[PDB]
Assembly symmetry: C3
Homo-oligomer: 160 residues x 3
Amino acid sequence: QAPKEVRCKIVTISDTRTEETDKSGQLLHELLKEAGHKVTSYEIVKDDKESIQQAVLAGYHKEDVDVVLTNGGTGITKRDVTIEAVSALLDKEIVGFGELFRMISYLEDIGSSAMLSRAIGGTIGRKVVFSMPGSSGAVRLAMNKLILPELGHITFELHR
Amino acid sequence: KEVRCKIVTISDTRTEETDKSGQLLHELLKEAGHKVTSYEIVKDDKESIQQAVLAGYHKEDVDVVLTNGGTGITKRDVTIEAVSALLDKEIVGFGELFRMISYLEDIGSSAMLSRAIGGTIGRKVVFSMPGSSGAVRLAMNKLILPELGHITFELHR
Amino acid sequence: QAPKEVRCKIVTISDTRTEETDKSGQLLHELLKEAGHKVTSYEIVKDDKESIQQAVLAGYHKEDVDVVLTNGGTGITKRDVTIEAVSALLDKEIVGFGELFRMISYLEDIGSSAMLSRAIGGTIGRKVVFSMPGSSGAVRLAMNKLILPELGHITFELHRQ
């Protein structure tokens, strides 16, 4: 009867970003607001597995949070642990997210660089989590091409 | 090369009279020059799914097992996990290309949620796809049908 | 600065090929040289898990080797073990390599056959490994579309890490 309002927690994974410099977290808020959704939780967490997992679970336990969106901490180096940290908490991995994110990035944005891109999405109970790279461009593509178009559908399916 | 296939429709609600996808699989195979040697609608639970796949594997006149239905992102959708546990080697390109093609040529972003898996079991192969006839049609026309002969040939060498 | 010269080891997985008939190994060398890179190690290894892993680790331990590139031994049958053999050694798998390799192969070269193609890329310490099918067409695509464009950046990222 009306565009469902999805409530989300934004998590920016970085050892250096602050509220004044968190461009990607700010972008996530603007994209969600414009799409008719709401941000009910936001925090910048240190870049380590335990901090990331704690932030995701904190969002999960918040009554007014339906989805957890994280950005940053991804990469091919040993110090990049976002994907592994989040993967460990997922009930079911929505593999199509990471796959299509890379495919679309390759064809429409960064080309071959997308080969090194890492992203993951999945469910935890009746809620969902999407973890994307930290650049604003990665965030914008993932949100506009994949997440925003499906948020309402996913939450609906998980709550039924 | 007339590949023999078993068709498994995973559903708690479909019947022979309403199984569109199972019927479509029949038609697509027939038109392609292949044959259906086994068919059944099995309840939607992990054990019924696995038993149906293994039943096809153990049938002398079944080269390939094709299943449709039971997929999804919810807790009660277990097809991919049920079938994955039985595979010797996963043909990862099936699920991947199925989603890529679906995204580009059909359902767009909805494909991000689509689930499908293919792989080998001994000298046989299994392909599990979503339950809608559209998913079945795309998977068969774009990926499975053109490769059935090639795969069975490679596995029987 | 200047185009960094990456040092690579070429591994051809085969029970029949010889240095004279190794068409794919020769192609890899050519592509790398024209791209400004260098081959500091090369060997044709028998097609079995243990030989493949040994050849990859030998490359890792070689002081003047930054990247290991293997071709051959891939397939969907039980006797094709390259991907599983290499996968067991990787610290972190660069999933985008295999995925994009198949996607591009589908769209530009072999269509549906790409569904059966197998390839894997990943890191071992501060070094990287890419394993691709043995056909010249597979090698050409993997190298031109994905590896060559990113070699410099990858090694750079891993050297600093």
